Amino acid sequence: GQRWELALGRFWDYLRWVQTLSEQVQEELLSSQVTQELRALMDETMKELKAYKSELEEQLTAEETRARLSKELQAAQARLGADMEDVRGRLVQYRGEVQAMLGQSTEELRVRLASHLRKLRKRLLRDADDLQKRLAVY
């Protein structure tokens, strides 16, 4: 229950809501509200993540190994940020495709988005787990 975990949890809960593609989700998806609110949550998560790592380095248990673990951690951090950006990007894409439909039914478009989001979210949880496991030793 660390700070950065609570932040990610809020990003994750918000994303779970979006996955439902409910009436309200849809409303905010055609505006920039969902992607904007997701960016704020992502920024907060990365911000707390950096602060946490910084504080962790204050009580660390050779050099080559330390430099390797710090780089491996840095990579996991990047994967997660990238993951969150990929989700945002996919949602931005959705918004554009609906506009391209010129008013046509978006049922099928939503079916595809739903399936893709599920996979992007799988990857995000997978990387978050990896990142947490790496911080656990660090």
Swiss-Prot record:
**What's the impact of mutating residue 115 to R?**
Increased binding to LDL receptor
Quote the annotated effect of residue 6 to P. Found in a patient with hypercholesterolemia; uncertain significance; ApoE4 Freiburg
Q: What does the annotation give as the result of altering residue 20 to A? A: In ApoE3 Freiburg
Q: Quick one: effect of changing residue 82 to V?
A: In ApoE3 Basel
Q: What is the effect of changing residue 39 to T?
A: Changes the plasma lipoprotein distribution of ApoE4 to the HDL
Reported impact of residue 122 to E: In HLPP3; ApoE1 Harrisburg; decreased binding to LDL receptor; probable dominant negative effect; decreased in vitro binding to heparin
Instruction: Kindly list the places in or outside the cell where this protein is found, as annotated in its UniProt entry.
Output: Secreted; Secreted, Extracellular space; Secreted, Extracellular space, Extracellular matrix; Extracellular vesicle
Instruction: Summarize the impact of residue 122 to Q.
Output: In HLPP3; ApoE2**
Where does the record place its sequence repeats? 40-61, 62-81, 82-103, 104-125
Coiled coil stretches, renumbered: none
Q: Superkingdom of this entry's organism?
A: Eukaryota
- Consequence the record notes for mutating residue 120 to P: Decreased binding to LDL receptor
Tissues expressed in: Produced by several tissues and cell types and mainly found associated with lipid particles in the plasma, the interstitial fluid and lymph. Mainly synthesized by liver hepatocytes. Significant quantities are also produced in brain, mainly by astrocytes and glial cells in the cerebral cortex, but also by neurons in frontal cortex and hippocampus. It is also expressed by cells of the peripheral nervous system. Also expressed by adrenal gland, testis, ovary, skin, kidney, spleen and adipose tissue and macrophages in various tissues.
For this protein, what post-translational modification is recorded in UniProt? APOE exists as multiple glycosylated and sialylated glycoforms within cells and in plasma. The extent of glycosylation and sialylation are tissue and context specific. Plasma APOE undergoes desialylation and is less glycosylated and sialylated than the cellular form. Glycosylation is not required for proper expression and secretion. O-glycosylated with core 1 or possibly core 8 glycans. Glycated in plasma VLDL of normal subjects, and of hyperglycemic diabetic patients at a higher level (2-3 fold).
Instruction: List residues, modification Phosphoserine.
Output: 105
Q: How does it assemble?
A: Homotetramer. May interact with ABCA1; functionally associated with ABCA1 in the biogenesis of HDLs. May interact with APP/A4 amyloid-beta peptide; the interaction is extremely stable in vitro but its physiological significance is unclear. May interact with MAPT. May interact with MAP2. In the cerebrospinal fluid, interacts with secreted SORL1. Interacts with PMEL; this allows the loading of PMEL luminal fragment on ILVs to induce fibril nucleation.
Q: What is this protein for, i.e. what is its function? A: APOE is an apolipoprotein, a protein associating with lipid particles, that mainly functions in lipoprotein-mediated lipid transport between organs via the plasma and interstitial fluids. APOE is a core component of plasma lipoproteins and is involved in their production, conversion and clearance. Apolipoproteins are amphipathic molecules that interact both with lipids of the lipoprotein particle core and the aqueous environment of the plasma. (Microbial infection) Through its interaction with HCV envelope glycoprotein E2, participates in the attachment of HCV to HSPGs and other receptors (LDLr, VLDLr, and SR-B1) on the cell surface and to the assembly, maturation and infectivity of HCV viral particles. This interaction is probably promoted via the up-regulation of cellular autophagy by the virus.
Give the disease entry from the UniProt record: Hyperlipoproteinemia 3: A disorder characterized by the accumulation of intermediate-density lipoprotein particles (IDL or broad-beta-lipoprotein) rich in cholesterol. Clinical features include xanthomas, yellowish lipid deposits in the palmar crease, or less specific on tendons and on elbows. The disorder rarely manifests before the third decade in men. In women, it is usually expressed only after the menopause. Alzheimer disease 2: A late-onset form of Alzheimer disease. Alzheimer disease is a neurodegenerative disorder characterized by progressive dementia, loss of cognitive abilities, and deposition of fibrillar amyloid proteins as intraneuronal neurofibrillary tangles, extracellular amyloid plaques and vascular amyloid deposits. The major constituents of these plaques are neurotoxic amyloid-beta protein 40 and amyloid-beta protein 42, that are produced by the proteolysis of the transmembrane APP protein.
The family classification in the record reads: Belongs to the apolipoprotein A1/A4/E family.
**UniProt-recorded name of the protein:** Apolipoprotein E
Gene transcribed to yield this protein: APOE
